[PDB]
Amino acid sequence: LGVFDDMNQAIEAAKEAQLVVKKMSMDQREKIISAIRKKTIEHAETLARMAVEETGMGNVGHKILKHQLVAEKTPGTEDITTTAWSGDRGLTLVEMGPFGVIGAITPCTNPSETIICNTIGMLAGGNTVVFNPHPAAIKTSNFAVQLINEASLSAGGPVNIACSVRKPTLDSSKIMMSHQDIPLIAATGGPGVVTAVLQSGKRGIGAGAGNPPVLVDETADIRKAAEDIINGCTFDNNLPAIAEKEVVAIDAIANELMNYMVKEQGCYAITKEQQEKLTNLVITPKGLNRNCVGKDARTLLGMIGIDNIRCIIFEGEKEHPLISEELMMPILGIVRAKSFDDAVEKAVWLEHGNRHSAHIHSKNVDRITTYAKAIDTAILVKNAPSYAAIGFGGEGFCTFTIASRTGEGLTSASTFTKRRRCVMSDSLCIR
Amino acid sequence: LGVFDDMNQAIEAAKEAQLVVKKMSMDQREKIISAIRKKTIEHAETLARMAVEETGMGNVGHKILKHQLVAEKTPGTEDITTTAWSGDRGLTLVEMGPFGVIGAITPCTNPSETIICNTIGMLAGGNTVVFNPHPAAIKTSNFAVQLINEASLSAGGPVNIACSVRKPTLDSSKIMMSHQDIPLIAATGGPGVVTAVLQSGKRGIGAGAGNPPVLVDETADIRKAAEDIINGCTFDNNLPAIAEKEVVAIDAIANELMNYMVKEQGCYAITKEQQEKLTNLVITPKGLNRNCVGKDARTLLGMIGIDNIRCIIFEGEKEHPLISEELMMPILGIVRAKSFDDAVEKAVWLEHGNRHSAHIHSKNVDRITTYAKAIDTAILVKNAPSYAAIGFGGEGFCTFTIASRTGEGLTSASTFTKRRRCVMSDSLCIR
Amino acid sequence: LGVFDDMNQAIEAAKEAQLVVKKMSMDQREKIISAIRKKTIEHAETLARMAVEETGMGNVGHKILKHQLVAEKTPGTEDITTTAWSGDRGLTLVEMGPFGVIGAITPCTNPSETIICNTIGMLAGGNTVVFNPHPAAIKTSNFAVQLINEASLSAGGPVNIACSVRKPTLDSSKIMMSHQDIPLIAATGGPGVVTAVLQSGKRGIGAGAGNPPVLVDETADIRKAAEDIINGCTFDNNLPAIAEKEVVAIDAIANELMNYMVKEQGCYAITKEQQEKLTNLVITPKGLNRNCVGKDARTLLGMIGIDNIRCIIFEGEKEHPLISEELMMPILGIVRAKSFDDAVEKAVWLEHGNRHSAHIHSKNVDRITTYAKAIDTAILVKNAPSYAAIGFGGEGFCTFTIASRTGEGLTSASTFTKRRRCVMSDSLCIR
Amino acid sequence: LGVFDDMNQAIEAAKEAQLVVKKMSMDQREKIISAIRKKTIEHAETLARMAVEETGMGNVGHKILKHQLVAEKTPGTEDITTTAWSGDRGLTLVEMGPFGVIGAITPCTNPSETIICNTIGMLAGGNTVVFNPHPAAIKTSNFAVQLINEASLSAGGPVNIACSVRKPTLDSSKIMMSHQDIPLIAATGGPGVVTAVLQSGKRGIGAGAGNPPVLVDETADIRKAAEDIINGCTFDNNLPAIAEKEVVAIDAIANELMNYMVKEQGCYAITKEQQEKLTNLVITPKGLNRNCVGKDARTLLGMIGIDNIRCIIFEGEKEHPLISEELMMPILGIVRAKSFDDAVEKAVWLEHGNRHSAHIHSKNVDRITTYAKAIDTAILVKNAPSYAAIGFGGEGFCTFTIASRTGEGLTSASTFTKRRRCVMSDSLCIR
Ligand SMILES: CC(C)(COP(=O)(O)OP(=O)(O)OC[C@H]1O[C@@H](n2cnc3c(N)ncnc32)[C@H](O)[C@@H]1OP(=O)(O)O)[C@@H](O)C(=O)NCCC(=O)NCCS
Ligand SMILES: CC(C)(COP(=O)(O)OP(=O)(O)OC[C@H]1O[C@@H](n2cnc3c(N)ncnc32)[C@H](O)[C@@H]1OP(=O)(O)O)[C@@H](O)C(=O)NCCC(=O)NCCS
Ligand SMILES: CC(C)(COP(=O)(O)OP(=O)(O)OC[C@H]1O[C@@H](n2cnc3c(N)ncnc32)[C@H](O)[C@@H]1OP(=O)(O)O)[C@@H](O)C(=O)NCCC(=O)NCCS
Ligand SMILES: CC(C)(COP(=O)(O)OP(=O)(O)OC[C@H]1O[C@@H](n2cnc3c(N)ncnc32)[C@H](O)[C@@H]1OP(=O)(O)O)[C@@H](O)C(=O)NCCC(=O)NCCS
């Protein structure tokens, strides 16, 4: 249901559906969107269980919360807005119109979250969407597509507002990328897929990688910073791109911070020898060990023969491979800094020019400003866990497509629209 | 001044300048922008004369007005705006940050207009820009770059906020497109350059082609529609992408309309035989005749041995090559329509799926709506000349980079920025 | 529950509640607001029945729809918004803070609609409210107050977010008006109460009277204009201030229009003699006959011995007392106009400088503009029934407090807040 | 020129002018506004000198800067904005229309600043204005009116966009307040005039009094706080309502702060005996000594026989009459606080429920938030002089009419407009 044997079929189906969607009222779109939100909540446990079973990554309870967040806080048609300028020369409107059929490449970390979040946004703007799901999360992804189409059916149709394929491949992704009925592709993934999309001759909205540092200075609430940082790091076993993945801590509070992490936040400190063993396990000749990504801390420790604990920590240099590299594992090094400017320099290196996400615990407005300016990320969270950036304990809406590479930031319905100016000359200014 | 021997030098220079620009206050940027506006006005006659002399296209008086429009109505730092959401969970800001060094590929139709308009916008957002000017308008383009740098010098620097090269080529455009210090390219030109940009692995903001129809229905002010349409068509000899390039007229008013065009608007009606000769002249085995593009009507008529007149008109079918093809010449066919829905169908075919610009003369709100929905263009002008779309007799700002292919519409400073969300958790909501 | 024996008690109670509300999160306010919306829908039939029984005015089915509209389309906390300006000099925020305890004077036409609509808006902005209900609709009004407090209790409190008195009087309204703990009064009623409020030394948000003309010109869809106009006029038996209360029709379509009204819209045309009898009935030495206001057409006709029909119509001069005077009865005179400018002149006289509401059926953009500029009302509806102005078949939110006298227009949560500027100097601009 | 013998003449003249202004284009209004800005700058020295000579208050150099600020940063027609909502049900616009002729009551502290600032704003929205100037600043005020009319003449008229009377009185203010052609009064003054305006049966936009505390905590940059606070306090000899008028300082930094004030900021510390003499001088049986208001510190000290120095300071209790009372003199008491919460409590008492202005020097986000929430003022400045609140070293526009009593905050053009909703049903949504 919405799932096809080949990519050309999927696209044609979505194209037919879009002729209806584009003519639907906002109330009609919103009825479908409401049905999607409801079904996402109703089946959050199933979606969450499916992802862990299929990919081996993450954990069920956190994926339930992520789907609840998508359902509650993804913008709908209220995100489609109009500007008006009027005067003696008349009325000029700027509207957000559909692109048409949008292609979307989705990850195996937040598979159904991305699919459902993209769909709500894209439908609100009058589009339909065709997915090429990640090959490691195909069943989970297509289940979400099927749910979306059931929701639309329950609200009177049409079917195929979201489409996918049974056996997504590099080849089927290439059919999408070169298909002339797809004017826009939303690429949520790694530099591999995204560069390909930005080489397609289409507009591409491109997520990128991150390696988010969290800087803690001596003005911070250190007890709360420990709680926030481990909560954010270990959320869905560090799978989210936004999650804290290393700490830069001012010398004077580093011991207090790590002590709290061990004593109150379920962190286990590993020795140099244990760091060496863990490094050899999780970084391989083929790169990141796929058998380790998104595993919980107790499992990773077990894998190297070390038997409550939810995070692995240690103090190290920024160049340490478990600190400099984005692991998507609950492994969190603490880098000690001599001074604030030292700390900012370390955090900037650690972010690696991704301009994705960065975090700080500090009560000082000048410090916060300095860091924000220097690090220049799509996301900056101050005195909360990273997930405050997508509306979990922070103001603002949720997305799972953070267009750090192409600059649109946290994408929503308005992102996936074409701008149209309508100039009504010398009339309809009523003033 | 701002002009370099090779593209790598240009880019490095712009990159150095941008480290200063990004740290400049809005007042500092605006001082430079004001100086640029002033200099553009001061040298509009020179820029206009240079373009006609160098390219052989357009006319001086209209290019003066286009530069005046750029100077008066291109947005500056006021276009860089901030959103805030606040509540018990604190304060979330969304800001527009710089990309960095932006590459820009510019046309030979509105060469200096595009360069100056792009620069004002890009500087406002904290960027610098490197141009690869059109090879047919190199001297005009680089003069504009030099003016921009003189303006910046007059306001205290820095130099190289806008850079270019002495001898732009396909090769130098390729250095820009593949340069890792350029994260964004603004491509103002034809499908050739734009597709290349959208294959570059960078975000590309892409202008496209158009073929703007103007539909006149029987409710229109026909005398004024004749005036508006010929004024818009013949503006800078039909060079602008937005200009009217064919008419679709309801049968009942078509004769009245064309009569007005001949009697009051300086139009000359050509016979079938003359249409045939003109077609053979302006469409060639190599495509559009470069020796004809942007020539005035008296010149084009002279070229086929026909000796006040500012536009060539005739009645014909939509498929007629002087009607279906975008000529950028003051040649305007009138296509007769049986009914409104017939007229909309003809206009939609004639726009060729460019979703660029379209125009209508009608006083009927339902008719206007029908047409606007069906034609789905970045620009729709109602009851005015096309140039009302860029702020000449219409509400709204000016641009010369209309991103019809990639969907950003009429570009301005905000277009050329990265979005950043800053989440201040549990503080700085003062309510 | 929320209802007190005397006004000073009510105000103190609301004042205590407001110390909690102002510190509530938007999510907490919205939980209560959601409960209020739900309860309003659940008890819409009861509220509607109570009003007709108590006041003798209006009709139950339409009052059900009015309460559904209030519940669905009154803005909540989303209407409380923040502006931000940032640059080198730091960050400036403008926020909407509470006034405190707001007093409100409400009508007997839309009693509970006004109370519930005011409360949702006022609560969203951090205020509480104290009502002095209309003495003709006390039981209906206080039932609505009780419902509001039940909703708040169901969501965890506090009680007394809305308060009222058991026996509202002119005297108790004067205690409210002169009470130093009430910095703002929202006055929904007649010139009597509103002027008193604007003499109170407090800010007053003041509804005024109207006499809304609907102009139909020869370009209109006349069959649909007949339907829309009688639907709008007869909605809740013409009680709403926005409702059509006289027609100005271009000569050429007047007969067609009235024919449709009689043949398809349940209108009964009265003779001059019948007009005379009806005039003597409904206009009295004491003014409008209270026994006639808000009665259906069949009843009014019966009252003068005339026995499907839902509206009384006739053709007459603008000065005819059943045309020039706001009756809040389904009595609708048609004034014939020679020309558009004649029609605009007649409609402007008929609106009596209230600048409240006016309506037009016309497909011509210039005509619409002319009329809109000339009539200068808080509300102008084009080609729909009047109730499109409050979100019933038109874009936009619902209100029952239209501040035509003081200029705030269709009031909502943002209306009832104080503006606060917060200047964070030389920090927290992250760009 | 714009100045009349009696108030009825002034109002009729303004009423005639407004029929033209309301029909003027934004470009036409802005041409006049530009001329007003230019003339204000050109004659700032004259306006400044006139005020000091006439009233005996303030100082010329600071009044020059205040007029430069008015000219540069008062919003014009860009502050008049439009909202649009569109969908299947059509297009709804909300516009800002004129009130008409606005009455304005202006002060003798910032006489011409208020007049010019009000006029720019009011003209932008399509209004004209009639002033009743303060009787102590009549010549200065009417000079400003004359300048405004010269500016309008220079831009082609009309004359009388701003009107005044030769001999303003309580009686002429009452003619304005009760005049039926004035639907709105902007009252910039003391509780006396404002309450009268809020008793007039008109909408009144009401400035109120203040007594702005500046709280300095132990996290502040104390050297800079000393500079900022004395600069803000002593600006135009403490005449502005926004200016710092007492300090609440955390014990631990109070001595450092006052030491800096004496050593670097030209403060003179007075003994208890000198405080007693100064109190007897400046507070009298008739209230504030008019012969002392707005005098410089050297003069006030001289007046009690005490002979570089620009501010008088001393440490005292909050109830000390030179601390608790708003003096509009460069007299600044420092109140010592035991703790932050103590300091907030003291500052809140000192503001006296005016909800006007308050200030803080602190680098701590939580502290700032606590204070902002507790003090609930129209203006809160953090880590700058008070005048950052009107755009002098802070983000945001300038006003001299801060509607603290009625809640509109820092008034501008949009403040002085009526809101109009225009519902275009089932057309002109182009999506
Ligand atoms: C989670 C992860 C380790 C799983 O690895 P995996 O199972 O081997 O799958 P991969 O993502 O490496 O991709 C396998 C191949 O399919 C491609 N691919 C990825 N997503 C695809 C999709 N929807 N559709 C089609 N092909 C896809 C990849 O490019 C790759 O091809 P390649 O061999 O030419 O490089 C990996 O996806 C990853 O590291 N993702 C992080 C990217 C990201 O968004 N990071 C921010 C979050 S912290
Ligand atoms: C005006 C015009 C007829 C002049 O033609 P021209 O002098 O032959 O120049 P061209 O634009 O055709 O380009 C010549 C070559 O340089 C390329 N080129 C164009 N702009 C370039 C630029 N800034 N920098 C480097 N190369 C450029 C072209 O791709 C082309 O290469 P190709 O042979 O591989 O196709 C032509 O530019 C044109 O038709 N432009 C319309 C595009 C447009 O924006 N239309 C909307 C306005 S109505
Ligand atoms: C419906 C209506 C005819 C009922 O008349 P009514 O039962 O006699 O009640 P009234 O509104 O005339 O008011 C009776 C008295 O109580 C006053 N009053 C009205 N509302 C009051 C309220 N909430 N609380 C206290 N007193 C109120 C009135 O000022 C009046 O006092 P008065 O004798 O000094 O003038 C009358 O309210 C009316 O005409 N309202 C229209 C006002 C309006 O908003 N029109 C736009 C809608 S079309
Ligand atoms: C500066 C000041 C001390 C000068 O005092 P003044 O010369 O005696 O003039 P006043 O303002 O006291 O007013 C004198 C009388 O004219 C009235 N008045 C004030 N402004 C008026 C105006 N434009 N037009 C007509 N009457 C006016 C006053 O109400 C007063 O009448 P009253 O005797 O019934 O009370 C006094 O105006 C003042 O204290 N203003 C502060 C109000 C304010 O805005 N404070 C915030 C700034 S810190």
Numbering used by the authors:
A (entry chain A), B (entry chain A), C (entry chain A), D (entry chain A): 29 to 335, 339 to 462
Quote from the publication.
The structures of Cphy1178 were also solved with mutations in active site residues, C269A with bound CoA (1.77 Å resolution) and H387A (2.08 Å resolution) to ensure that mutation of these residues did not destabilise the structure of the protein. The structure of Cphy117820–462(C269A) was determined using crystals soaked with 10 mM CoA. The cofactor showed good electron density for the adenosine group, but poor density for the pantothenic acid group, particularly the terminal region with the sulphydryl group in the active site, which has no visible electron density. While there is clear electron density for the nucleotide and phosphate-proximal portion of the pantothenate group of the CoA, the β-mercapto ethylamine group is not visible, indicating that the distal arm of CoA is flexible in the absence of thio-acyl substrates bound to the catalytic cysteine for acyl transfer. The adenine ring is flipped by 180 degrees relative to its position in the NAD+ structure and makes hydrogen-bonding contacts with both the side chain and carbonyl oxygen of Asparagine 160, and the carbonyl oxygen of Threonine 134, placing the phospho-ribose group above both of the nucleotide binding pockets. The phosphate groups between the nucleotide and pantothenate group are held in place by hydrogen bonds formed between the side-chain nitrogen atoms of Histidine 162 and Arginine 318. A comparison of the structure of the NAD+ and CoA bound forms of the protein show that the structures are essentially identical, with an rmsd Cα of 0.24 Å over 431 residues. The two structures differ only in the position of the loop between residues 215 and 223, where P219, G220 and V221 are shifted toward the adenine ring in the NAD+-bound structure. In contrast to the models of CoA binding to the Pseudomonas DmpF aldehyde dehydrogenase36 and Lactobacillus reuteri PduP aldehyde dehydrogenase25 our crystal structure shows distinct adenine-binding modes for NAD+ and CoA.
Here, we study the kinetics and substrate specificity of an AldDH enzyme from the Clostridium phytofermentans fucose/rhamnose utilisation BMC, Cphy1178. The overall structure corresponds to other members in the aldehyde dehydrogenase family, with a catalytic domain (residues 238–427, highlighted pink), a cofactor-binding domain with the Rossman-fold type nucleotide binding architecture (residues 28–108, 127–237, and 428–447, highlighted grey), and an oligomerisation domain (residues 109–126 and 448–462, highlighted green). The catalytic and nucleotide binding domains come together to form an extended nucleotide and ligand-binding tunnel that is open at both ends, with the catalytic cysteine (C269) at the centre of the tunnel and the NAD+ cofactor binding at one side. Cphy1178 forms a tetrameric quaternary structure generated by crystal symmetry, with molecules related by D2 symmetry.
